[PDB]
Design a protein around this nucleic acid. Structure first.
Lengths: 66, 87, 104, 116, 51
RNA sequence: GGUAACCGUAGGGGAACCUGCGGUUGGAUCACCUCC
RNA sequence: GUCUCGUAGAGGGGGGUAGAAUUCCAGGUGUAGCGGUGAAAUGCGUAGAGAUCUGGAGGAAUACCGGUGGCGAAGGCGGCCCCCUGGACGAAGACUGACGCUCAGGUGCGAAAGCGUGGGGAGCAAACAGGAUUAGAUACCCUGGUAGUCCACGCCGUAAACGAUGUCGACUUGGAGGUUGUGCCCUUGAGGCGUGGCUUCCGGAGCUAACGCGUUAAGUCGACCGCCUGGGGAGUACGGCCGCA
């Protein structure tokens, strides 16, 4: 079930961790759209945010790294 | 260009800020874009996708001038000499 | 002149003059009438994955409206000085100012 | 000699061979065995029975250091190699965590082609 | 997945790679080539929809 | 959740063709009493 | 056609930067094998390999998101960020007043392979060397490995470059979905009525020899351009032009 269309956010943020941690699998892979039901544009902005936060070492590439 | 550049350029050739559609102001805008953009390709050799837009603007300017040629030669010549257009 | 978002990252033993970095950088931005909308200090923080065999480093964030020349001067200063390990620069569509969720 | 008692192990799980190595946490190799170190060749080696006998064979080398708890990473897509760690568990080694590391290149160097 | 679990021993738990990982990796990657002739592979996935 | 063939091009060679790189689906063949 | 406000997007260049991985180098541990096939063998092996750890050099493409999704006239475009910049669409309102469509010659762009001069070289890999095997056949299989694949400045201008469907208009019942804008309603939290673009699939009338197409036509019409006149010889011979070849 979707969240962004329900809450009516205009732009989704990349600094906050709580929202986008829900949309990653345990292994660091981004969850596909069809699993979660989020709309396509918001999924695209999600992925943009995942890369943007992952650059800053706020979110891991994959769970292999210690 | 930019909003202030367009706002200042429309008045130099058009009417009381509401016309912005005449042939004179149109050719002024296109020629401003061409004169500004020629410095881009002076360095970026490999680009060929914006060249299509450049040639489209040049063709539009040429078509406008050929229309003005039949329409009124006096304003045609005044525009070309005051803008610096060879023909 | 347009909006920008900037963060950078500081080596732990070099943290003692981080106020110096903030002072110098803010002076640089205001040197050309540049307007700062937000400054945050996140303190010492753990890393998701190590950088330069380092498990922790210092965090600083700011959000400014400033001209291109000052943005380049900043980015050159960060790439030249080794005291910063990573940097980020963005554009924004509007002058966002409200509270960041990172400290909420 | 030198007591470890909480050792770590690595297993390689290629299609053609299996290599087992026991590590003293920090990189250090103490004992190892391979599926080919007992005269095995050909189809007798492809099945995971060769891997299991190699795994039990590592024991007589490992028990000199007195290790009780064991840690292991598996690497390789070889069929039936996941059953190898059960042999070390039955050997008396207290397994507490089995991780997996398969090296996935992020579409890097181009892969060659197999036989048609 | 770091496999750390409670006291029960050898509860398998290795089976769930179905959801975490695409089973084709290391067979379509690091050897041979793939991704050619894509359209026929995708079309059959929905041509069977019937009522 | 079986298989191929045809293009463009470069190197090698004849019952007959091979591979290297990119592309397409047009992804399968037959309808022969006098005797060999 | 122009202007005001916005939206989406692997549109194109230039420069940085990050993680994963194949190599090579240096130093520890450690022992007799490693590699590859159905077997194998060639090949790597103890003046010290693979396996494991740390550190370092260099190259290429950016897992995951990732889809019968998006952009572009076409070829084709996929990590992230900065700079430059082409095009499309929506909302109302204003302005120019036929400025238009097509286009012989002409000019430009044009996947990969291939040449010319200079760099770089991880992986892959025509030719070529070795081993092996079936089948007189080599080829397929496995070790190595040169051009090339990468980057600079130019040539070449060819493909099943295909949607096998030239471009531009107006007109003719329906249905299902995708992607992206936006009006009306107190939005009685993600919801209801309506209107625009671009797209994937059923199917009516009509058309076609049939397969089928079917508002994104191969339906009913108009404007212009290109092309075809039985098969092989043959897209070949002789000329001209282009090209260093």
């Amino acid at each position: 079930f979707c969240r962004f269309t329900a809450e009516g956010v205009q732009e989704i943020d990349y600094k906050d961790i709580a929202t986008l941690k829900n949309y990653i699998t345990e292994s660091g892979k981004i969850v596909p759209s069809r699993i979660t039901g989020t709309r396509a544009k918001y999924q695209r902005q999600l992925a943009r945010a995942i890369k943007r936060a992952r650059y800053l070492s706020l979110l891991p590439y994959t769970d292999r790294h210690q | 260009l930019s909003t202030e550049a367009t706002a200042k350029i429309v008045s130099e050739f058009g009417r009381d800020a509401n016309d912005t559609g005449s042939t004179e102001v149109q050719v002024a805008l296109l020629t401003a874009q061409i004169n500004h953009l020629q410095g881009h390709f002076a360095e970026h050799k490999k680009d060929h996708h914006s060249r299509r837009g450049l040639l489209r603007m040049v063709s539009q300017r040429r078509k406008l001038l050929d229309y003005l040629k039949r329409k009124d030669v006096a304003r045609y010549t005044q525009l070309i000499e005051r803008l610096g257009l060879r023909r | 002149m347009r909006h920008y978002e900037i963060v950078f990252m500081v080596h732990p033993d070099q943290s003692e003059q981080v106020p110096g970095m903030i002072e110098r950088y803010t002076a640089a931005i205001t040197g050309a009438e540049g307007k700062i909308h937000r400054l945050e200090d996140w303190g010492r923080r753990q890393l998701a994955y190590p950088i330069n065999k380092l498990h922790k480093a210092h965090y600083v964030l700011m959000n400014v409206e400033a001209p291109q020349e000052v943005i380049d001067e900043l980015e050159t200063t960060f790439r030249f000085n080794d005291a910063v390990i990573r940097s980020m620069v963005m554009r924004t569509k509007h002058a966002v100012t409200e509270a960041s969720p990172m400290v909420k | 000699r030198k007591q470890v008692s909480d050792g770590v192990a690595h297993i390689h799980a290629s299609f053609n061979n299996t290599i087992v190595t026991i590590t003293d946490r920090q990189g250090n190799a103490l004992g190892w065995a391979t599926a080919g170190g007992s005269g095995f060749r050909g189809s007798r080696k492809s099945t995971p029975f060769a891997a299991q006998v190699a795994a039990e064979r590592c024991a007589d080398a490992v028990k000199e250091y007195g290790i009780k708890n064991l840690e292991v990473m598996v690497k390789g897509p070889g069929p039936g190699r996941e059953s190898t760690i059960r042999a070390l568990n039955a050997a008396g080694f207290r397994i507490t965590n089995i991780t997996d590391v398969t090296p996935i290149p992020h579409n890097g160097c181009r892969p060659p082609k197999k036989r048609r | 997945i770091k496999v750390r679990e409670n006291e029960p021993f050898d509860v398998a738990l290795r089976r769930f790679k179905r959801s975490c990982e695409k089973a084709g990796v290391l067979a379509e990657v690091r050897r041979r080539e793939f991704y050619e002739k894509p359209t026929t592979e995708r079309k059959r996935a929905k041509a069977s929809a019937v009522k």
